[PDB]
Amino acid sequence: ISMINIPAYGHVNPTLALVEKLCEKGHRVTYATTEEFAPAVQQAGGEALIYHTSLSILPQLEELYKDDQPDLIIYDFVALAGKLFLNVPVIKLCSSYAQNESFQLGNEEQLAVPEALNIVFMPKSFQIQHETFDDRFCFVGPSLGESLLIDKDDRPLMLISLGTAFNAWPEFYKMCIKAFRDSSWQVIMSVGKTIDPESLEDIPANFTIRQSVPQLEVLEKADLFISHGGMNSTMEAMNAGVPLVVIPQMYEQELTANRVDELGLGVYLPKEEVTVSSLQEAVQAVSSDQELLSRVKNMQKDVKEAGGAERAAAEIEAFMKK
């Protein structure tokens, strides 16, 4: 089994727990990625078939290593390179929303037809217009593995992380400090490289400011997560049953922000309305809403019942028949 995937963490990381499941089941998993994702793929048992790209291109690099022809193709829905290939059974991975004849991603050949098996890394309840998706799509939820020393107090814990979004918006992190400085919240805030924490004037006692944090592990203790609306961060929030305040930047993150809001799993706070006061208001409204939290608990149940990397690896196997 070879799986072709574009070089971006958001697409690679749900695949990692699945190559580990496939490897432990006695399969050969080759993985076309750059050197950037080579250590993570090989740490999960994959064979990193390195390739070069100018980070609608060409699959010549993958064609080169054609000598050891793979037995099954599994391409991320964006890496159309893998879809091109040799009468080999193929499987599509939907690291975002799945698309069919009734719903497509877009605001404005025939390679975007749904495969016989399409694996989507969200529960079906989260998919936009899920009523229109048939047996061709298998909604397995986030594909996570199976830690660190976070103890915390008996007061509510907040995670703040915008991920790769708003990399030139250091005022956001300053507004968060002013918003929750004197509150009963304990705040863990990941700033990436957007702002140097030591450059800050007075880091409050209830804040912990890092460049990066183990987001999965913080979420298991967190009571609220101010996020940017990436699919992975949103599904990790729901896997842990953590309500959301979503501040999106990109188009797909805006869809998810609206999706979170319409499912009653949190609030969508657009970037242009983000102030010290609206951050306080959003956190106060979400954290004090018990019916919202039970809906988040319901969605957490949907995430668990979705099957994860194990159900996806099993459906990949039962697919082998033609």
Q: Which element (helix H / strand E) includes 225?
A: strand 224-227
Specify the resolution in Å.
Answer: 2.2
Sheet holding 207-210, edge to edge: 207-210, 186-190, 157-161, 224-227, 244-246, 266-268
Cβ neighbourhood burial of 191 (10 Å; 0-12, 13-18, 19+): buried
- DSSP type of residue 148: -
Residue in this structure with the two tokens 């949103």, named with its chain if needed: 234
Q: How far apart are CA 65 and CA 69, in angstroms?
A: 8
As a whole number of angstroms, the distance between CA 50 and CA 130 comes to 36
Structure tokens at 286: 């979400």
- The three-point CA angle 18-310-15 to 5° equals 15
The CA–CA distances, whole Å, from 256 to 2, 14, 33, 97, 137 equal 30, 17, 27, 9, 19
Dist CA 234 CA 221 (whole Å)? 16
CA distance 257 to 252: 9
Residue 155 is given by DSSP the state: S
Return the closest-CA partner of residue 190 out of 204, 210, 172: 210
In this structure, the number of other CB atoms found within 10 A of the CB of residue 33 comes to 24
User: Binding site: residue ranges?
Assistant: 13, 164, 190, 213, 228, 232-236
Going from the C-alpha of 287 to that of each of 247, 280, 292, 318, the distances in angstroms are 16, 11, 9, 43
SS3 320: coil
Instruction: Count other C-beta atoms under 10 Å from residue 154's C-beta.
Output: 6
Tokens 């149940």 found at: 301
Residue listed under structure tokens 């990381």: 13
Our separate counts of H helices and E strands in the chain read 11, 13
Binding-site residue positions for UDP: 13, 164, 190, 213, 228, 232-236
Residue 97 · residue 103 · CB < 8 Å = yes
Can you give the residue ranges of every domain in the chain?
1-146+306-322, 147-305
Length of the chain: 322
Say if residues 309 and 21 touch (Cβ distance below 8 Å).
yes
State the Rg of the chain over Cα: 21
- Structure tokens, 157: 């814990």
Question: Can you tell me which residue has the tokens 């390679």?
Answer: 111
DSSP per-residue codes, 156-218:
-EEEEE-TTS-TT-HHHHHHHHHHHTTSS-EEEEE-TTSS-GGGSS---TTEEEES---HHHH
Q: Are 233 and 163 in contact (CB under 8 A)?
A: yes
Residue 48: beta bridge partners?
31
Q: How far is it, in rounded angstroms, from Cα 38 to Cα 196? A: 29
DSSP secondary structure of 47-110: EEEE---------HHHHHTTSS--S-EEEETT-HHHHH-----EEEEESS----SS--------
122 three-state secondary structure: coil
Q: Which amino acid is at 322?
A: K
Q: Rounded to whole angstroms, what are the CA distances from 172 to 160, 177, 194?
A: 10, 9, 10
Q: With contact defined as beta carbons under 8 Å apart, do 122 and 238 qualify?
A: no
Determination technique for this PDB entry?
A: X-ray
